[PDB]
Amino acid sequence: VNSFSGYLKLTDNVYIKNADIVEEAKKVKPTVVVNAANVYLKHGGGVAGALNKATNNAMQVESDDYIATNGPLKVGGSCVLSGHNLAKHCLHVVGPNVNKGEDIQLLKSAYENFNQHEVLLAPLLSAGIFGADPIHSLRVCVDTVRTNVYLAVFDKNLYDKLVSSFL
Ligand SMILES: CC[C@](C)(CO)Nc1ncnc2[nH]ccc12
Ligand SMILES: [Cl-]
């Protein structure tokens, strides 16, 4: 039993809700919140910009030190950093950004990072300003993640389409 509330159950382990991931994380304070990251951990917009703003830029400061030490992430890769005031940990995961011409096949690799954590709050990878089909991102999530994932969808219209088209 966990403290996530109001989710629709899609499969044994995948759940989905119309919610603002920022407001969800503050309420639940999950062990792991997923960020929709880029390889440079520059959290300028989309989910990343919103999560970083909620940390008063502390996420960005920590991220800049991480990049200075380690260099950029790989597309499809991840790193674990602090969750600041939002969660214990933030799993920064880089899905392909279609608006950069990145291979959509790397979306499965991106979701594989979730399997290293028993329970996660997350957005749909490569959705939003990363320019992938969110229905596809859900299909890949369900077919790749085996741990317990609570998916937050900001747009209510998109949330309803995700549910009604789900196979
Ligand atoms: C619309 C769905 C998605 C593309 C990925 O799930 N964007 C978000 N999901 C959840 N919370 C969010 N806050 C800001 C953006 C955002
Ligand atoms: Cl977005």
PDB file of all heavy atoms in Angstrom, residues 56-77:
ATOM      1  N   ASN A  56      13.104  26.092  -6.563  1.00  0.00           N
ATOM      2  CA  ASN A  56      13.756  27.391  -6.425  1.00  0.00           C
ATOM      3  C   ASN A  56      15.141  27.388  -7.085  1.00  0.00           C
ATOM      4  O   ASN A  56      16.066  28.064  -6.628  1.00  0.00           O
ATOM      5  CB  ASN A  56      13.812  27.808  -4.941  1.00  0.00           C
ATOM      6  CG  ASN A  56      14.399  29.187  -4.718  1.00  0.00           C
ATOM      7  OD1 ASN A  56      14.093  30.123  -5.448  1.00  0.00           O
ATOM      8  ND2 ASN A  56      15.237  29.322  -3.689  1.00  0.00           N
ATOM      9  N   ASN A  57      15.297  26.627  -8.171  1.00  0.00           N
ATOM     10  CA  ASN A  57      16.526  26.504  -8.968  1.00  0.00           C
ATOM     11  C   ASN A  57      17.585  25.615  -8.309  1.00  0.00           C
ATOM     12  O   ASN A  57      18.683  25.474  -8.868  1.00  0.00           O
ATOM     13  CB  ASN A  57      17.153  27.853  -9.365  1.00  0.00           C
ATOM     14  CG  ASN A  57      17.871  27.795 -10.693  1.00  0.00           C
ATOM     15  OD1 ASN A  57      17.327  27.312 -11.687  1.00  0.00           O
ATOM     16  ND2 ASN A  57      19.097  28.303 -10.726  1.00  0.00           N
ATOM     17  N   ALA A  58      17.305  25.005  -7.156  1.00  0.00           N
ATOM     18  CA  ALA A  58      18.299  24.131  -6.542  1.00  0.00           C
ATOM     19  C   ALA A  58      18.582  22.910  -7.411  1.00  0.00           C
ATOM     20  O   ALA A  58      19.723  22.434  -7.459  1.00  0.00           O
ATOM     21  CB  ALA A  58      17.844  23.720  -5.141  1.00  0.00           C
ATOM     22  N   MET A  59      17.569  22.404  -8.119  1.00  0.00           N
ATOM     23  CA  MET A  59      17.799  21.295  -9.043  1.00  0.00           C
ATOM     24  C   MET A  59      18.817  21.674 -10.118  1.00  0.00           C
ATOM     25  O   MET A  59      19.719  20.887 -10.438  1.00  0.00           O
ATOM     26  CB  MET A  59      16.467  20.848  -9.656  1.00  0.00           C
ATOM     27  CG  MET A  59      16.585  19.739 -10.691  1.00  0.00           C
ATOM     28  SD  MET A  59      14.996  19.252 -11.383  1.00  0.00           S
ATOM     29  CE  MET A  59      14.324  18.304 -10.011  1.00  0.00           C
ATOM     30  N   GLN A  60      18.692  22.879 -10.682  1.00  0.00           N
ATOM     31  CA  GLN A  60      19.628  23.317 -11.713  1.00  0.00           C
ATOM     32  C   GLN A  60      21.044  23.464 -11.163  1.00  0.00           C
ATOM     33  O   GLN A  60      22.012  23.074 -11.827  1.00  0.00           O
ATOM     34  CB  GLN A  60      19.164  24.634 -12.340  1.00  0.00           C
ATOM     35  CG  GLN A  60      19.953  24.994 -13.581  1.00  0.00           C
ATOM     36  CD  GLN A  60      19.749  23.967 -14.671  1.00  0.00           C
ATOM     37  OE1 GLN A  60      18.641  23.843 -15.206  1.00  0.00           O
ATOM     38  NE2 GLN A  60      20.777  23.179 -14.963  1.00  0.00           N
ATOM     39  N   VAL A  61      21.185  24.048  -9.968  1.00  0.00           N
ATOM     40  CA  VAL A  61      22.508  24.223  -9.367  1.00  0.00           C
ATOM     41  C   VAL A  61      23.184  22.867  -9.170  1.00  0.00           C
ATOM     42  O   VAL A  61      24.356  22.670  -9.528  1.00  0.00           O
ATOM     43  CB  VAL A  61      22.393  25.019  -8.054  1.00  0.00           C
ATOM     44  CG1 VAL A  61      23.713  25.029  -7.313  1.00  0.00           C
ATOM     45  CG2 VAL A  61      21.915  26.448  -8.340  1.00  0.00           C
ATOM     46  N   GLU A  62      22.445  21.899  -8.617  1.00  0.00           N
ATOM     47  CA  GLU A  62      22.982  20.558  -8.422  1.00  0.00           C
ATOM     48  C   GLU A  62      23.344  19.917  -9.757  1.00  0.00           C
ATOM     49  O   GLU A  62      24.375  19.236  -9.886  1.00  0.00           O
ATOM     50  CB  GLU A  62      21.933  19.721  -7.689  1.00  0.00           C
ATOM     51  CG  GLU A  62      22.336  18.280  -7.469  1.00  0.00           C
ATOM     52  CD  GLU A  62      21.168  17.397  -7.087  1.00  0.00           C
ATOM     53  OE1 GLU A  62      20.036  17.671  -7.547  1.00  0.00           O
ATOM     54  OE2 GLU A  62      21.392  16.411  -6.348  1.00  0.00           O
ATOM     55  N   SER A  63      22.473  20.097 -10.753  1.00  0.00           N
ATOM     56  CA  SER A  63      22.689  19.511 -12.069  1.00  0.00           C
ATOM     57  C   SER A  63      23.929  20.082 -12.746  1.00  0.00           C
ATOM     58  O   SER A  63      24.667  19.353 -13.421  1.00  0.00           O
ATOM     59  CB  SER A  63      21.462  19.755 -12.952  1.00  0.00           C
ATOM     60  OG  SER A  63      20.325  19.045 -12.481  1.00  0.00           O
ATOM     61  N   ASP A  64      24.166  21.391 -12.606  1.00  0.00           N
ATOM     62  CA  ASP A  64      25.336  21.987 -13.244  1.00  0.00           C
ATOM     63  C   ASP A  64      26.624  21.407 -12.664  1.00  0.00           C
ATOM     64  O   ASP A  64      27.592  21.158 -13.397  1.00  0.00           O
ATOM     65  CB  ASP A  64      25.305  23.503 -13.079  1.00  0.00           C
ATOM     66  CG  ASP A  64      24.253  24.185 -13.964  1.00  0.00           C
ATOM     67  OD1 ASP A  64      23.638  23.535 -14.840  1.00  0.00           O
ATOM     68  OD2 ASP A  64      24.069  25.402 -13.780  1.00  0.00           O
ATOM     69  N   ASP A  65      26.648  21.161 -11.355  1.00  0.00           N
ATOM     70  CA  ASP A  65      27.800  20.502 -10.750  1.00  0.00           C
ATOM     71  C   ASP A  65      27.944  19.071 -11.260  1.00  0.00           C
ATOM     72  O   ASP A  65      29.058  18.612 -11.532  1.00  0.00           O
ATOM     73  CB  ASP A  65      27.673  20.524  -9.230  1.00  0.00           C
ATOM     74  CG  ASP A  65      28.715  19.659  -8.546  1.00  0.00           C
ATOM     75  OD1 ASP A  65      29.861  20.133  -8.360  1.00  0.00           O
ATOM     76  OD2 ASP A  65      28.388  18.498  -8.204  1.00  0.00           O
ATOM     77  N   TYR A  66      26.827  18.362 -11.424  1.00  0.00           N
ATOM     78  CA  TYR A  66      26.899  16.994 -11.928  1.00  0.00           C
ATOM     79  C   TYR A  66      27.493  16.949 -13.336  1.00  0.00           C
ATOM     80  O   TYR A  66      28.327  16.084 -13.637  1.00  0.00           O
ATOM     81  CB  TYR A  66      25.509  16.343 -11.888  1.00  0.00           C
ATOM     82  CG  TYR A  66      25.523  14.960 -12.490  1.00  0.00           C
ATOM     83  CD1 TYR A  66      25.743  13.836 -11.705  1.00  0.00           C
ATOM     84  CD2 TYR A  66      25.378  14.787 -13.859  1.00  0.00           C
ATOM     85  CE1 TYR A  66      25.794  12.572 -12.273  1.00  0.00           C
ATOM     86  CE2 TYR A  66      25.438  13.544 -14.430  1.00  0.00           C
ATOM     87  CZ  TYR A  66      25.643  12.440 -13.633  1.00  0.00           C
ATOM     88  OH  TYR A  66      25.711  11.199 -14.209  1.00  0.00           O
ATOM     89  N   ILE A  67      27.075  17.865 -14.215  1.00  0.00           N
ATOM     90  CA  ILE A  67      27.600  17.894 -15.578  1.00  0.00           C
ATOM     91  C   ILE A  67      29.066  18.313 -15.594  1.00  0.00           C
ATOM     92  O   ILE A  67      29.868  17.769 -16.362  1.00  0.00           O
ATOM     93  CB  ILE A  67      26.734  18.805 -16.471  1.00  0.00           C
ATOM     94  CG1 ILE A  67      25.309  18.262 -16.604  1.00  0.00           C
ATOM     95  CG2 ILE A  67      27.395  19.024 -17.841  1.00  0.00           C
ATOM     96  CD1 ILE A  67      25.182  17.045 -17.486  1.00  0.00           C
ATOM     97  N   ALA A  68      29.437  19.286 -14.763  1.00  0.00           N
ATOM     98  CA  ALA A  68      30.831  19.708 -14.722  1.00  0.00           C
ATOM     99  C   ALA A  68      31.745  18.554 -14.335  1.00  0.00           C
ATOM    100  O   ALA A  68      32.874  18.465 -14.822  1.00  0.00           O
ATOM    101  CB  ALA A  68      31.000  20.872 -13.750  1.00  0.00           C
ATOM    102  N   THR A  69      31.267  17.643 -13.487  1.00  0.00           N
ATOM    103  CA  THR A  69      32.072  16.507 -13.053  1.00  0.00           C
ATOM    104  C   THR A  69      32.036  15.354 -14.046  1.00  0.00           C
ATOM    105  O   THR A  69      33.070  14.717 -14.298  1.00  0.00           O
ATOM    106  CB  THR A  69      31.561  16.015 -11.704  1.00  0.00           C
ATOM    107  OG1 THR A  69      31.735  17.052 -10.734  1.00  0.00           O
ATOM    108  CG2 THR A  69      32.293  14.748 -11.263  1.00  0.00           C
ATOM    109  N   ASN A  70      30.854  15.051 -14.599  1.00  0.00           N
ATOM    110  CA  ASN A  70      30.617  13.795 -15.301  1.00  0.00           C
ATOM    111  C   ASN A  70      30.386  13.930 -16.796  1.00  0.00           C
ATOM    112  O   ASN A  70      30.422  12.911 -17.497  1.00  0.00           O
ATOM    113  CB  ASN A  70      29.406  13.078 -14.689  1.00  0.00           C
ATOM    114  CG  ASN A  70      29.602  12.779 -13.226  1.00  0.00           C
ATOM    115  OD1 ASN A  70      28.981  13.407 -12.367  1.00  0.00           O
ATOM    116  ND2 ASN A  70      30.489  11.855 -12.930  1.00  0.00           N
ATOM    117  N   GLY A  71      30.136  15.133 -17.297  1.00  0.00           N
ATOM    118  CA  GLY A  71      29.765  15.321 -18.679  1.00  0.00           C
ATOM    119  C   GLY A  71      28.316  14.944 -18.927  1.00  0.00           C
ATOM    120  O   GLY A  71      27.597  14.499 -18.023  1.00  0.00           O
ATOM    121  N   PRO A  72      27.865  15.133 -20.169  1.00  0.00           N
ATOM    122  CA  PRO A  72      26.453  14.906 -20.493  1.00  0.00           C
ATOM    123  C   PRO A  72      26.035  13.448 -20.349  1.00  0.00           C
ATOM    124  O   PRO A  72      26.831  12.510 -20.466  1.00  0.00           O
ATOM    125  CB  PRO A  72      26.349  15.349 -21.957  1.00  0.00           C
ATOM    126  CG  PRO A  72      27.533  16.239 -22.190  1.00  0.00           C
ATOM    127  CD  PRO A  72      28.615  15.673 -21.316  1.00  0.00           C
ATOM    128  N   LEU A  73      24.742  13.272 -20.097  1.00  0.00           N
ATOM    129  CA  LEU A  73      24.135  11.954 -20.161  1.00  0.00           C
ATOM    130  C   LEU A  73      24.055  11.491 -21.614  1.00  0.00           C
ATOM    131  O   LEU A  73      24.291  12.250 -22.555  1.00  0.00           O
ATOM    132  CB  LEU A  73      22.729  11.981 -19.562  1.00  0.00           C
ATOM    133  CG  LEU A  73      22.598  12.291 -18.077  1.00  0.00           C
ATOM    134  CD1 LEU A  73      21.132  12.254 -17.653  1.00  0.00           C
ATOM    135  CD2 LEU A  73      23.416  11.366 -17.224  1.00  0.00           C
ATOM    136  N   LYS A  74      23.721  10.214 -21.783  1.00  0.00           N
ATOM    137  CA  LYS A  74      23.358   9.632 -23.072  1.00  0.00           C
ATOM    138  C   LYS A  74      21.852   9.769 -23.289  1.00  0.00           C
ATOM    139  O   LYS A  74      21.071   9.687 -22.343  1.00  0.00           O
ATOM    140  CB  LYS A  74      23.698   8.131 -23.086  1.00  0.00           C
ATOM    141  CG  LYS A  74      25.174   7.803 -22.875  1.00  0.00           C
ATOM    142  CD  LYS A  74      25.423   6.332 -22.620  1.00  0.00           C
ATOM    143  CE  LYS A  74      26.899   6.051 -22.476  1.00  0.00           C
ATOM    144  NZ  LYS A  74      27.189   4.622 -22.254  1.00  0.00           N
ATOM    145  N   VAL A  75      21.435   9.957 -24.545  1.00  0.00           N
ATOM    146  CA  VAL A  75      20.018   9.781 -24.860  1.00  0.00           C
ATOM    147  C   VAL A  75      19.643   8.337 -24.559  1.00  0.00           C
ATOM    148  O   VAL A  75      20.316   7.402 -25.008  1.00  0.00           O
ATOM    149  CB  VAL A  75      19.719  10.155 -26.321  1.00  0.00           C
ATOM    150  CG1 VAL A  75      18.242   9.935 -26.634  1.00  0.00           C
ATOM    151  CG2 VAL A  75      20.108  11.601 -26.604  1.00  0.00           C
ATOM    152  N   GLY A  76      18.571   8.144 -23.784  1.00  0.00           N
ATOM    153  CA  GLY A  76      18.209   6.843 -23.260  1.00  0.00           C
ATOM    154  C   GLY A  76      18.746   6.567 -21.873  1.00  0.00           C
ATOM    155  O   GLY A  76      18.362   5.558 -21.267  1.00  0.00           O
ATOM    156  N   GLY A  77      19.634   7.422 -21.361  1.00  0.00           N
ATOM    157  CA  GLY A  77      20.261   7.225 -20.074  1.00  0.00           C
ATOM    158  C   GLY A  77      19.618   8.033 -18.959  1.00  0.00           C
ATOM    159  O   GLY A  77      18.593   8.699 -19.130  1.00  0.00           O
TER     160      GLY A  77
END
